[PDB]
């Protein structure tokens with residue numbers, strides 16, 4: 132199945148957001164990232180995707196379709212706005228093995244706050 136995500140300058144959680152910022156998926160699903168506002172992209176964060184998953188980075192302002200294969204958690208960022216909190220968490224399958232690791236990993240404060248919200 133397909134899950135659509137909007138990339139926005141402003142949304143419910145404040146400035147520079149993915150909506151939704153929590154995406155539940157299964158292997159073989161697609162996540163479609165739509166640049167509703169300009170100035171955004173999607174990029175996998177180093178050491179915060181499952182072992183065996185391929186790294187990815189879209190171009191600024193492109194519609195990007197991600198196919199997810201490996202189970203686990205994926206933290207993705209908008210490259211220009213990572214420091215402003217623009218992230219999403221994709222959970223593929225049940226009980227992602229690397230979720231606690233991602234929560235503990237070094238990242239900007241605003242990112243950590245937003246991440247803890249989405250998990251909660």
Ligand SMILES: [Co+2]
Pocket residue numbers: 147170171172209210211212217
């Ligand atoms: Co952005």
